Symmetry: C4
Subunit: 353 residues, 4 copies
């Protein structure tokens, strides 16, 4: 007799995938108030951040100005690779010359990516991010492994992106110092629609963590974060840091000029797999768009950490490590409606909503 959803193979539909909106954190016994929570966390095996946030390696998000401001806010930036090797390495130099700030840089896969990585390491980069659509591909695992054996002593090597336990386990055996999770949840991403491929971000973190935690390897949750609450959910699912693109793209520090359409303020934000970024045989997996202007980075980060601090008070988590042990309740479409404010016209501006 058949599997309820079709066919005679119970593993054809392997699992049920949950995203951030499908779940809430459960309040627990607490001796923690928001002010006394400690928000520090491992970016990689060797690098601990004061604030568990990293800015995305995208040409509309992180250049030296964002990397500097992020590091000073206690987080880190990853410099995008959509520029010539000399300029990317130069921006690494601009950051390290602003007071020994932490900084990462993305590279792709191949000989040119190899030359890029070597120039970044010479410029003093702290973290190399091997930055690909599908980390489970053999080329990526080999590139991670070779950087690891070659520099490794010198620098941390992160690999992404993955959406499964087996892929995270493969990066760990390749020697990854951290594993970055997220195939298709990005706000500007179209992978799930163009290729039909991906995994909902909460389930993707839970699965990657089932592989990375036993190996002592930290998980970076990347993409799909829209609110401070999602950061707490990603960390409680077992991630150690979160990487943000659209939440940080509207900020003053993000590269790009202010757009003034309708006497309203916007900034361009685009996928690195979008047509405008890659530059007609290209098949793009991202879109180009715009986000509201959100003002200074510092005040965006204060709001995000403040929301995370509230979640730690609610779950009784004095540190990120205890937050990673929190429980979820799953919700329905109706519970999401309730979870957001409802049945009121919002008349005054809110900083975190």
């Amino acid at each position: 007799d058949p599997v309820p959803t079709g066919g005679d193979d119970p593993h054809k539909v392997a699992m049920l995938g949950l995203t951030f909106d499908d779940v809430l954190l459960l309040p627990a016994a607490s001796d923690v108030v928001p002010a006394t929570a400690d928000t520090s966390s491992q970016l990689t095996k060797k690098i601990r951040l004061k604030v568990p946030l990293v800015s995305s390696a995208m040409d509309t998000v992180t250049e030296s100005r964002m990397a500097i401001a992020m590091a000073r806010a206690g987080g880190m930036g990853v410099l995008h690779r959509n520029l010539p090797v000399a300029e990317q390495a130069g921006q690494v130099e601009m950051v390290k010359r602003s007071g020994g700030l932490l900084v990462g840089a993305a590279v792709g896969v191949g000989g040119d990516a190899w030359v890029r990585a070597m120039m970044l390491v010479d410029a003093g980069v702290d973290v190399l991010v091997v930055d690909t659509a599908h980390a489970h591909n053999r080329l990526v695992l080999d590139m991670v492994g070779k950087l690891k054996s070659e520099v490794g002593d010198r620098v941390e090597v992160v690999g992404g992106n993955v959406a499964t336990r087996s892929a995270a386990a493969a990066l760990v055996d390749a020697g990854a110092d951290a594993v970055k999770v997220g195939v298709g949840p990005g706000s500007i991403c179209t992978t799930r629609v163009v290729a039909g491929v991906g995994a909902p971000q909460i389930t993707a973190i839970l699965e990657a963590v089932a592989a990375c935690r036993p190996a002592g390897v930290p998980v970076i949750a990347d993409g799909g974060l829209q609110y401070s609450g999602d950061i707490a959910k990603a960390l409680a699912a077992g991630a150690s840091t979160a990487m943000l693109g659209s939440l940080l793209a509207g900020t003053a520090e993000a590269p790009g000029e202010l757009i003034f359409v309708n006497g309203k303020q916007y900034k361009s934000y685009r996928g690195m797999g979008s047509l405008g970024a890659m530059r007609d045989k290209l098949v793009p997996e991202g879109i180009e768009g715009r986000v509201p202007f959100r003002g200074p980075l510092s005040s965006v980060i204060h709001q995000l950490t403040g929301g995370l601090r509230a979640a730690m008070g609610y779950t009784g988590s004095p540190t990120i490590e205890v937050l990673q042990q929190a429980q979820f309740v799953r919700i329905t479409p109706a519970g999401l409606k309730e979870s957001h404010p409802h049945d009121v016209a919002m008349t005054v501006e809110a900083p975190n909503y």
Copy 2:
């Protein structure tokens, strides 16, 4: 082999959370007609109300005028604490001097909250509501316990808010005379989005009740009530009273002036954790907004009790205590669409819809 939603921990996603919209009451055998239902119910262990409704302790909802009108309608009001101690206590005096009416007042936690509580008790308040975001926090449980031991004989002490069985059990062992349930369902609340924390209100009541009912402690369902039907659902899930903010904020008795935008009538309604209420390092967990003007309180309460009376006739519940034994059917997104009127342009105004 994994848990279907991710990882190897079957308790990581502890349960499935239902809100008011996810469920309907099942009709049952009835010898009860709406007119003959008895709507009385316990607010606390010592205090029984004629109508099982309480107005929220919010600066846009309950001041002496609302408390007076609520008590005369057979319910009760809880005076908000966003004012100086002398004025809050003075408003308690204004209410008690209108004919021995019942009244509650909110307090926070701490020495100033202690002084506030002592002035309220001296003014003759009947119920102290310890009014916090997270009742499971140690400070709140201690504050409940100390008020209980100190005044206790004199006054009833309610604690909130909670969303779990263990938190309700902790308030009961601290000596709470009632437990108030609701983390994040409020119409103006942003906790679930800012902190990612909460529990859907039907499941939250069912769980709190599993702890409070064996201890003979009544549950106040607080927040997320939009229609008279939700009140019946909350009571049938085991709550003894319901607390309303937005349903009562549009009324004449609510503090605040009438707003006339578009030749339409509104009243301001805002979270107590909203930016405008608390008064840039604040991290708000509510929004400021507006609700339609709904006219006299008395006629709003008549509609709410009338809807509750209909539910009692449908479920065969002569009293609230029997209603608390009713059954639910769970519905899908499509069943909600059907449950509301559909496929018609509503052309004339309805008092309860």
Copy 3:
């Protein structure tokens, strides 16, 4: 350890409720083409209709003109009771004098309802419909029983409305000749919102049928039917006839004048529990609104039967009795989107969509 949705009572949430939109009929082996399907079916134990459709007893739907046209189309009408007893009985006379046409009439419960029923029976009505919000109430069951014992020989007695197996079983033991199912699915109904009470219509039919079919008592599915496809679903769930309000209210034969707002054509349609119908202590359980004008009844019925005929060809059902043995597939929100036409601007008018 708890029930997943809350508490320690596995029966508190008794079941999962499906509505028409949650399910599709499964195609089966067929030697039936739409043209050769036989659409006849039992209205009651004694009365078989050529077309398994009845018009609702509502003041915006069925008066003598609709009853006449319905009967001539092979269905039946139920004359509403929102008029004086002499006029209702007179309309029964107008119908019987148009060629021995079938006709029903609604009555409520009580002595006045008793006098009304006796005048209707004298006028020659074929079916008395005891027409109430909650058939499981003791007054309704007694009224059904007394009419049954008193007239019974003379006339058929239908009872409604019910949403459960136990309520349908109670009407059967009271002597009902048919059981009408539907609490809250009506397009103009607000019971599920005002009282929070009801059951999704597919599950409600399946349950009523589990009680009525073993007793040889036909089930009338009443309310929530928006498309011809829903009629086939209701019959396949085990109903023998369907009762329609909004699908027939836009027709020329429906009482009421044509409304011409925006150079568009509408007809008033309102719940019998709406404020305008019942005529400020009333608590209404319906709304007043308007529906598009749909032209002649005859061509609406042709479309509805044609859709039902297609379903019979698809399921291989030569008769309604075989259709009642068909199977459903349950769908998700995404399957409903797919089921309706999608991703196209509809530019030309369709008669059945």
Copy 4:
């Protein structure tokens, strides 16, 4: 004790139906990059295509121009039958005279359909598509069988449409060379609403394949495909080719003139069961509408194959046959929201979104 959704029959609701939007492909270990994927696949038992795509047999989609362009792009077209037999056969001749291109043609059931098929076979058609609403009907199975025995040696015979395992098994025993799947998922289809009949397309493919694969008979997934990602999902569910209507209707090669409403470009697209196509006793099962103009076919096909190539790289599938072994993760409504780009205003045009 009852079945949770109603009644005492566990098979009344036979299964849970998934559509394309309910699922994503899971990334897997890969030694495949998009460029090196091989997209060839069986259309029928005897015919392998370079690109696993077929254009729909609809009067707004496939006439000789589309059939020619499709075949040159490595796919195939099926010429619609809403024209006189001499013109349809003539269009077959126009295609075969453009360099030995592959071509199919639709026929219905009956003697006229028989004469049509014989003229098509004489014109040199490669595939006859027996093109009906319900393939499980006895007339269709006999028509498939008779064509098979009569021509069979000469030509391939495909049968559709089906939505169940038993129906696909019946076509296989009738001698079908391929089975076409899809009852009601079409963008312009109204079967699920008019008749209430159908099955969600992912489950329908899984079930048909459970019957066709053991018999070595290829499955054509037909209808409901809106994005390149859906094609990959349909193939991974076990289909061998996909048939497209609306994705190809906006193209220059599609029959019909360009529409210029609002200084925007559209093309007419309509169901073959729509009122305008069939030409008031007709009961239509489709609508007439319009789709955006999408430019040259060639560049639409490049985008579709490019998306499919990405999915093959992500799942580690060097060929379509390995893709058919990929796994799904099921998603919720919230996961779909995430899967599409979200929380950004799309400002620049995307070729595949």
